[PDB]
Swiss-Prot record, chain A:
GO molecular-function terms, A-Z: rRNA binding; structural constituent of ribosome
Name under which the protein is recorded: Large ribosomal subunit protein uL4
Keyword Transferase: no
Its job: One of the primary rRNA binding proteins, this protein initially binds near the 5'-end of the 23S rRNA. It is important during the early stages of 50S assembly. It makes multiple contacts with different domains of the 23S rRNA in the assembled 50S subunit and ribosome. Forms part of the polypeptide exit tunnel.
Organism from which the protein derives: Enterococcus faecalis (strain ATCC 700802 / V583)
Gene this chain is encoded by: rplD
Curated annotation (Swiss-Prot), chain B:
One GO CC term on file: cytosolic large ribosomal subunit
Function: Binds to the 23S rRNA.
Regions of compositional bias (Basic and acidic residues) in chain numbering: 1-10
Full protein name: Large ribosomal subunit protein uL15
Gene name for this UniProt entry: rplO
NCBIfam families in UniProt: rplO_bact
Pfam family of the protein (one): Ribosomal_L27A
Entry keyword RNA-binding: yes
Compositionally skewed regions (Gly residues) per UniProt: 23-35, 42-51
InterPro entries per record: Ribosomal_uL15, Ribosomal_uL15/eL18, Ribosomal_uL15/eL18_sf, Ribosomal_uL15_bac-type, Ribosomal_uL15_CS
Keywords, ordered alphabetically: Ribonucleoprotein, Ribosomal protein, RNA-binding, rRNA-binding
Keyword Hydrolase (UniProt): no
Molecular functions (GO terms): rRNA binding; structural constituent of ribosome
Organism domain of life: Bacteria
Organism: Enterococcus faecalis (strain ATCC 700802 / V583)
UniProtKB/Swiss-Prot annotation, chain C:
Listed PROSITE patterns: RIBOSOMAL_L35 (PS00936)
Keyword Protein biosynthesis (UniProt): no
NCBIfam families listed in its UniProt record: rpmI_bact
Protein name: Large ribosomal subunit protein bL35
Protein family: Belongs to the bacterial ribosomal protein bL35 family.
Biased composition (Basic residues): 1-15, 22-44
Pfam families noted in UniProt: Ribosomal_L35p
Organism of this sequence: Enterococcus faecalis (strain ATCC 700802 / V583)
Annotated keywords: Ribonucleoprotein, Ribosomal protein
Location of the region described as Disordered in the Swiss-Prot/TrEMBL record: 1-52
Molecular-function annotations in GO: structural constituent of ribosome
InterPro entries the record matches: Ribosomal_bL35, Ribosomal_bL35-like, Ribosomal_bL35_CS, Ribosomal_bL35_sf
Amino acid sequence: ENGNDFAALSARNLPNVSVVTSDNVSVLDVVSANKVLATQTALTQIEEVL
Amino acid sequence: MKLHELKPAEGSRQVRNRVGRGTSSGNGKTAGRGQKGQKARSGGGVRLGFEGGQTPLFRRLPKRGFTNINRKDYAVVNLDTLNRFEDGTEVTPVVLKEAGIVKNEKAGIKVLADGELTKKLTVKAAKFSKSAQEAIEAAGGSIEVI
Amino acid sequence: PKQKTHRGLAKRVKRTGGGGLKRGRAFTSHRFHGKTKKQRRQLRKASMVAKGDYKRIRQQLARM
RNA sequence: UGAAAUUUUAGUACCUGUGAAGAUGCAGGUUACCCGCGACAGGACGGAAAGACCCCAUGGAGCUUUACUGUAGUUUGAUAU
RNA sequence: GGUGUAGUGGUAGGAGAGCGUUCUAAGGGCGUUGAAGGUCGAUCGUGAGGACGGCUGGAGCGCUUAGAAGUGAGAAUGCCG
RNA sequence: GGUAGCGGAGAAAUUCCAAACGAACUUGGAGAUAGCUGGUUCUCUCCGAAAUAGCUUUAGGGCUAGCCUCGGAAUUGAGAA
RNA sequence: GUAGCGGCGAGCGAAACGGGAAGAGCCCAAACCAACAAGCUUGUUGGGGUUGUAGGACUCCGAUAUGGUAGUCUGUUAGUAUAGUUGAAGGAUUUGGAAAAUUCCGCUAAAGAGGGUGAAAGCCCCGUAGACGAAAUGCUGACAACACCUAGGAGGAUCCUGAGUACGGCGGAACACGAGAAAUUCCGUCGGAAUCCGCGGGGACCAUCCCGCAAGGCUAAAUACUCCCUAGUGACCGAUAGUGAACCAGUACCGUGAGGGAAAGGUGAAAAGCACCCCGGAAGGGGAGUGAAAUAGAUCCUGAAACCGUGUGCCUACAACAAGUCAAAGCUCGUUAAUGAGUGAUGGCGUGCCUUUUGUAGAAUGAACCGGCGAGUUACGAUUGCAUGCGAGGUUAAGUCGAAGAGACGGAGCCGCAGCGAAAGCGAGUCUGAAUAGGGCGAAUGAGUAUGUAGUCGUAGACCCGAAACCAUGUGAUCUA
Ligand SMILES: [K+]
Ligand SMILES: [K+]
Ligand SMILES: [K+]
Ligand SMILES: [K+]
Ligand SMILES: [K+]
Ligand SMILES: [K+]
Ligand SMILES: [K+]
Ligand SMILES: [K+]
Ligand SMILES: [K+]
Ligand SMILES: [K+]
Ligand SMILES: [K+]
Ligand SMILES: [K+]
Ligand SMILES: [K+]
Ligand SMILES: [K+]
Ligand SMILES: [K+]
Ligand SMILES: [K+]
Ligand SMILES: [K+]
Ligand SMILES: [K+]
Ligand SMILES: [K+]
Ligand SMILES: [K+]
Ligand SMILES: [K+]
Ligand SMILES: [K+]
Ligand SMILES: [K+]
Ligand SMILES: [K+]
Ligand SMILES: [K+]
Ligand SMILES: [K+]
Ligand SMILES: [K+]
Ligand SMILES: [K+]
Ligand SMILES: [K+]
Ligand SMILES: [Mg+2]
Ligand SMILES: [Mg+2]
Ligand SMILES: [Mg+2]
Ligand SMILES: [Mg+2]
Ligand SMILES: [Mg+2]
Ligand SMILES: [Mg+2]
Ligand SMILES: [Mg+2]
Ligand SMILES: [Mg+2]
Ligand SMILES: [Mg+2]
Ligand SMILES: [Mg+2]
Ligand SMILES: [Mg+2]
Ligand SMILES: [Mg+2]
Ligand SMILES: [Mg+2]
Ligand SMILES: [Mg+2]
Ligand SMILES: [Mg+2]
Ligand SMILES: [Mg+2]
Ligand SMILES: [Mg+2]
Ligand SMILES: [Mg+2]
Ligand SMILES: [Mg+2]
Ligand SMILES: [Mg+2]
Ligand SMILES: [Mg+2]
Ligand SMILES: [Mg+2]
Ligand SMILES: [Mg+2]
Ligand SMILES: [Mg+2]
Ligand SMILES: [Mg+2]
Ligand SMILES: [Mg+2]
Ligand SMILES: [Mg+2]
Ligand SMILES: [Mg+2]
Ligand SMILES: [Mg+2]
Ligand SMILES: [Mg+2]
Ligand SMILES: [Mg+2]
Ligand SMILES: [Mg+2]
Ligand SMILES: [Mg+2]
Ligand SMILES: [Mg+2]
Ligand SMILES: [Mg+2]
Ligand SMILES: [Mg+2]
Ligand SMILES: [Mg+2]
Ligand SMILES: [Mg+2]
Ligand SMILES: [Mg+2]
Ligand SMILES: [Mg+2]
Ligand SMILES: [Mg+2]
């Protein structure tokens, strides 16, 4: 979800991790990723967006 | 899908045909243009409708008519489309635009009697055909010329 | 750029409901003493662009 | 000491015939051991120059005139100064 | 997949299906225990073409799926060497 | 030293104007235009012409039709012998 | 690509409305007032005033405020540009000349961007994430200061409101509009107004109506462009490519001059660039050395083909040969081990490739050979096929936010759902017609649309190369007249 800066920063540098905000998610990102780790608030915001 | 296993739908994409790439391809050498002539030249060919000097068809035919400056066209609506509304509903150009039936009303809505109306309605429009007015009123509705 | 319309044709033909082109008739300008009344009566009526002519010119009226 | 034009690859004969109708190369026959050197110029429709002759292109250019259309100049009138 | 019958010369040209080249993405790999490239070989496929060995070489390159093209030369009195 | 290309100069030859002057040279418009000539690069499979009519400042060009190819619709099956 | 313009040809081609980006409005001239000066007006100065629901002067009243600015090398302040500082984490084992590679255990990460290092490094180096930093000089923004603008109401008796102007004739030109029925705008020439009961415009012109107030000026933002500077990006080039120019390139060279205009990158990790010896006058070699490698020795990575030469397994001096192919003895050799390979006496058949042609072995054209380079592309539109989504519906464009992304919003607009008629107009009909007739085009009898992709077409150089030429700037009388 927006504003989770510490989570975003701490995760980004991992080679296998791609960080995206729930508001900015694209077909290419989802398809590239083998698994999707989402927070519950992020899922709520996604459901609202779609 | 997986980026390493993509597959387009069958027949969705085709391979471009490249000419002048050897004889066995069927477009080698002449590249399908044939042998000499005007149509075989780069940028060759005659302008559209040209007839090699025979008087073209449009020249043979006479001009006709004129355009009325005050021309008025009406967005047409038929009784079958009016059936989509409920009895007692007030049909209005705004109602039609909101319903998406008439995106562009032009000079105004004119109602025509193509189909069979079945609902009682009060219809407001720029114009009504005589048959359309009769059908609306016979269905127990009413018509008002906005 | 946008493909341009042939203005001469646009003045001389009309697009019909079925996609065809309605056209006037030739020989309807003058020298009527050289034509029988039957010819004049039957040239007064409009006609349609023939298949061959249409296939030559359709691209000039695409957006008429 | 050391070029050049040319050059599809060539183990590159003669006669008669054939063939896009004038063949070293195709047919029949004849002649001819292999490689050169000095000479000649019949042929390779030899080389050189996308024939200048001829015709064609709704090509070009220079020129002519009572070709067409313009026009610099020259002249005549009105008008302003 | 099997059987049967029929068919399969071809210029202009239409249709179809493929080979190979460079690059991008993803996946999965290979490389100083020798990549690409070069060279030789008596190898495989119906074709464009694909492997595998020996030698040379010395650092990058395949494969599968999809994508994009400066994507294939033997001729232009083509240009450069 | 002077005369400069819509030009100069010419005891006059279309003669000279930096080794080609019926209009210098250089750059630009400019990749002028070329119904004309040449060239146009991998493979296999299916089918496969035309060199005719009509009209054309048209005749070695072009347009429609005829002949080829690919897809589709439909029929009281209309084609061929 | 509509309305239109157009030898009504070829073509040319709007504007308003609507949706957005950005937004900002202000000064004079004149009337009139005060002063000044000369010669009751007439010039200078200051005030005054600025306009169309007419304004202003002028006359009455009342307020001496209220707000604003597109000003200032005026400071004060902040930020920023131009140097910088800091910045985590690895050792072993195998191959190797060299480890970053391999293998085993670790560690770091707000840093796994990137580059370099003796081969391919998150942890070796420069860096990166992040944190921090400016004496001096610019730039920006704020704050303040100074500065400059900033009045309401009521009356019209009178005065002012842009003159050789607007406008007209003639001749041109600009408006998509080529004189056309032609408005509107402008130029030259001539003629030549009104002024608020006024004037201009609403595409000849007139009347009515509506809208506006010319002949004076200024004005930021959205917009166009990049020689340069800084930081980056690329399904862009990789030494015949990419700038002409990766290299001392606009150089060499060419030309009187304008001007034209090249070629030319790579030793190795490190010069460790071969001490010394030998042949030779040297050049150049052979040893000896360096090096992992010298057939990496400076013409230096790799090192193809043409071309040239050395060695030889087979064949060749009675043969007429598009040079091969088919058959084949002999000899030689033994492979991706295949009913093998090289050569080949001898015999059969057999006139190259390409282009262009009715027809070419052609004595028709092109190629000396080898290598490289060298020709249907892209953008915007049209149309068809195929594919996907939605479906009587389909869809957004510009623009805003966002990584130069996707995506979201944006429905203005476009296509389709109704046609017929020249048009008024009518409408599942409509037009022709006197017609309930006939007939035409339509409906009955419905699929479209957005996007992708491919075929073809149009506009563009439009598949590539090629004129003689035309036009517009320049450079040339050092030859020659
Ligand atoms: K074709
Ligand atoms: K007509
Ligand atoms: K006539
Ligand atoms: K011949
Ligand atoms: K001779
Ligand atoms: K000449
Ligand atoms: K090999
Ligand atoms: K060549
Ligand atoms: K002379
Ligand atoms: K348009
Ligand atoms: K014309
Ligand atoms: K004032
Ligand atoms: K190091
Ligand atoms: K590194
Ligand atoms: K500063
Ligand atoms: K006019
Ligand atoms: K108006
Ligand atoms: K107005
Ligand atoms: K080497
Ligand atoms: K030999
Ligand atoms: K033989
Ligand atoms: K000849
Ligand atoms: K009727
Ligand atoms: K009818
Ligand atoms: K569809
Ligand atoms: K399409
Ligand atoms: K082009
Ligand atoms: K094209
Ligand atoms: K002289
Ligand atoms: Mg494509
Ligand atoms: Mg063919
Ligand atoms: Mg060829
Ligand atoms: Mg040809
Ligand atoms: Mg042809
Ligand atoms: Mg008439
Ligand atoms: Mg007759
Ligand atoms: Mg004969
Ligand atoms: Mg003979
Ligand atoms: Mg022979
Ligand atoms: Mg010969
Ligand atoms: Mg000759
Ligand atoms: Mg000739
Ligand atoms: Mg057969
Ligand atoms: Mg490569
Ligand atoms: Mg190419
Ligand atoms: Mg060559
Ligand atoms: Mg003479
Ligand atoms: Mg001379
Ligand atoms: Mg031009
Ligand atoms: Mg056949
Ligand atoms: Mg004619
Ligand atoms: Mg021909
Ligand atoms: Mg560090
Ligand atoms: Mg390690
Ligand atoms: Mg004009
Ligand atoms: Mg005038
Ligand atoms: Mg006027
Ligand atoms: Mg008004
Ligand atoms: Mg501005
Ligand atoms: Mg270069
Ligand atoms: Mg190279
Ligand atoms: Mg160059
Ligand atoms: Mg070597
Ligand atoms: Mg070398
Ligand atoms: Mg004998
Ligand atoms: Mg013998
Ligand atoms: Mg002939
Ligand atoms: Mg030749
Ligand atoms: Mg001079
Ligand atoms: Mg001189």
